[PDB]
């Protein structure tokens, strides 16, 4: 009579968030859900070091096969952490490996809402941060005076094999940065389809966000989006009452979009942007809404077989300060809602993409959310939203558990 | 005896803002000031088109010669404006030509304040947008599959004449952008001195804003600014009451800075950033403060001979909707403060550079500001800040005029 969990990758971190998720797994999930299909991985900074990222390899492989991943917040083993945690070596951020390993098209950064508690945006906002390209994968050098040349040699079509000059310039400064990057745009077709599909389901008005007026190479991000929308979605948006007859898809400049995020406190909109613009704008979105914990960070990629790989994370870290407080015998109140939304999304996608116990899984994950929201409504949520009379971390975990049935 | 205005470049626009400035010139300036020294340029979109942009060339040349420029809001001759205004050809924004032509250092984007009126930020905020470099001057191509190569050949030092590879990559998309740009950092030494001097005078806490953690070529923007601060300013900031001893200059990630602009409603801080980050963050600043009209846009560049070239502009547009209302005979209420702040700056700089009627010009510009600010304190400002009881455009101009003496 327990729910059969679909295959799903579970990535454990450390510190306060792992302490919390251990309690959630043991007291909310496991008594109601057979988690035999989960493949669990220990991603403590120490276990990455001890296995020399063998664990990360096993995460990415598991993710490609299973297509549904929940990842806890983790400690990136930076220089600071090597000394602190007593490790052998440093290890970089695992996001690049995940985005490439799973053919990432977007990080979905959506506002998280609680029925009965008003946050910054009244209604759901959706945001797609294009997951590849841009300055994140640039080649560069810091240089003095000299000549900079950029060439391109196509490998197919009429001009195949003929090298052309993209740019050439004389650097006249003693101190300068020289930078080259690319934006791969083939997966913007996939991105547009995913984005507009999401926006239609949510009944939110979509917007495309670039600096294409000046950064003219960005034009195709808009053109691909507009074409997909017009041909495959506009009729549907009008029919669903989301947009009026003759309303065109709107393009916003990135510097205008920063203003709109502050103005549009009603919510009820979607934005899609390039990698960096999405990075900056979604943290703005976090601040307007409440804080980073109330925005999702959901990586979506395209499997070779046509289905989607979906990884889900909370947007806060491991809350080391709170872990320290716990280890000083001081009361804590970690709001688990960001992580729970991630776990819900992963469990739902696991059930959906594998077609295993879908009705019962969706019902259960909906039930967890409903119970949590009702507790917050009553002033029995965590202290971030319910003040000093709110529940401690452990009190909140019990409160949910005894209402779950 | 009228004030003899120092030589100054005056760039006129069109629509509502030109109509307002025509009245201000007629009713405030000309009865008190001999403006024979002003060289005026017609930058109607139609005049850029009619002169094959020779007028923009003339503006740049006059700006170099005279060193002080006031520019009204203008209509960029975009494709859409070509249709609307019946032009022959489209023309790009004039910004790049001005910023590069006058050896741009910074665009200062400061909150505008009136004593006794509450806007978004309680205390002054200062922002320096690095005026040049970045994607604004990028070379690019939209391409398919192939090989992209970037090389650099230094012209001086021990590695002179030896070509090295900055980047090489294989493009695997049928649609991709390939982009190369440079950041010229020699003038960040000047940017830093300018920024910290202003912040010191204003007694605001300075911050440097970059994405250098990931975009590592940006590191010198930070290093240059920190070195100048530590060597030339830190002790002064301590003695001014702004910072404690042992407090260091703070670096903010650009995605953190977007959150701080929303949080820090008390104001009293400064930020300096690269060209694009500055563009995006200062529009956010405008929205938090009130609107674009309440943020300055003051370009500071430098002549070959060391004299600063200063151009001052309001940050709003020409307000076409209000101009249409005006021409229908309907009431309007355009707040001229943004434009007048710009004109004040340009007139003051002209007076200081040329040393023509310096003391009387400063008294007159101070008077315009005081008279304007006092009318707002009396509820006799425009309707943006004083509500429906506020004065019309024309009523406000006449109210100021009769108080100027």
Curated annotation (Swiss-Prot), chains A, B:
GO CC terms: mitochondrion
UniProt effect for mutating residue 322 to H: Decreases affinity for NAD(+) 78-fold
Cofactor: Mg(2+); Mn(2+)
Temperature sensitivity of activity: Optimum temperature is 45 degrees Celsius.
EC id: 1.1.1.41
Catalytic activity: D-threo-isocitrate + NAD(+) = 2-oxoglutarate + CO2 + NADH
Cofactor comment: Binds 1 Mg(2+) or Mn(2+) ion per subunit.
Activity regulation (UniProt): The homodimer exhibits allosteric regulation by isocitrate.
Binding site residues for NAD(+): 74-76, 95, 260, 316-321, 335
Phenotype for residue 321 to R: Decreases affinity for NAD(+) 3-fold. Decreases affinity for NAD(+) 78-fold
SUPFAM superfamilies associated with the record: Isocitrate/Isopropylmalate dehydrogenase-like
Record InterPro entries: Isocitrate_DH_NADP (IPR004790), IsoPropMal-DH-like_dom (IPR024084)
Subcellular location: Mitochondrion
Keywords: Magnesium, Manganese, Metal-binding, Mitochondrion, NAD, Oxidoreductase, Transit peptide, Tricarboxylic acid cycle
Chain residues that bind D-threo-isocitrate: 93-99, 129, 136, 211, 255, 279
Biological function: Performs an essential role in the oxidative function of the tricarboxylic acid cycle and respiration. Catalyzes the decarboxylation of isocitrate to produce 2-oxoglutarate and generate NADH to provide electrons for energy production.
Family affiliation: Belongs to the isocitrate and isopropylmalate dehydrogenases family.
Protein's UniProt name: Isocitrate dehydrogenase (NAD(+)), mitochondrial
Gene: IDH
């Amino acid at each position: 009579s327990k729910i059969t969990a679909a295959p799903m990758v579970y990535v454990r971190g450390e510190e306060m968030t792992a302490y919390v998720m251990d309690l959630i797994r043991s007291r909310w999930i496991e008594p109601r859900v057979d988690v035999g299909g989960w493949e669990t991985f220990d991603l403590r900074a120490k276990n990455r070091d001890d296995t020399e990222d063998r664990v990360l390899r096993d995460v990415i492989e598991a993710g490609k096969r299973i297509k549904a991943i929940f990842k806890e917040p983790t400690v990136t083993p930076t220089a600071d952490q090597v000394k602190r945690l007593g490790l052998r070596k440093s290890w970089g951020s695992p996001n690049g490996a995940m985005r490439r390993g799973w053919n990432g098209i977007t990080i979905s950064r959506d506002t998280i809402h609680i029925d009965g508690v008003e946050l910054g945006y009244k209604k759901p906002v959706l945001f797609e941060r294009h997951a590849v390209g841009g300055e994140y994968s640039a080649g560069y050098k810091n240089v003095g005076k000299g000549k900079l040349t950029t060439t391109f040699t196509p490998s197919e079509g009429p001009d195949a094999g003929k090298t052309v000059v993209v740019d050439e310039r004389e650097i006249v400064d003693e101190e300068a940065a020289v930078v080259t990057y690319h934006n791969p745009y083939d997966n913007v077709h996939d991105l547009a389809r995913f984005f507009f599909g999401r926006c239609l389901e949510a009944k939110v008005t979509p917007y495309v966000v670039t600096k294409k007026t000046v950064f003219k190479w960005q034009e195709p991000f808009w053109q691909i989006m507009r074409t997909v929308f017009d041909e495959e979605f506009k009729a549907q948006f009008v029919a669903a009452g989301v947009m009026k007859e003759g309303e065109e898809l709107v393009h916003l400049l990135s510097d205008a979009a920063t203003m709109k995020l502050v103005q549009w406190r009603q919510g009820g909109f979607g934005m899609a942007a390039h990698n960096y613009d999405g990075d900056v704008l979604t943290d703005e979105l976090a601040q307007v809404h409440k804080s980073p914990g109330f925005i999702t960070s959901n990586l979506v990629g395209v499997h070779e077989d046509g289905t989607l790989i979906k990884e889900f994370e909370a947007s806060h870290g491991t809350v080391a300060d709170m872990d320290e407080a716990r280890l000083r015998g001081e009361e804590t109140s970690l709001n688990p809602l960001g992580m729970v939304e991630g776990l819900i999304g992963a469990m739902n996608h696991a059930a959906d993409v594998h077609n295993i116990d879908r009705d019962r899984t969706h019902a259960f994950t909906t039930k967890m959310r409903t119970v949590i929201h009702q507790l917050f409504r009553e002033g029995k949520g965590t202290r971030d939203l319910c003040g000093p009379s709110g529940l401690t971390t452990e009190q909140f975990i019990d409160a949910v558990a005894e209402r779950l049935d």
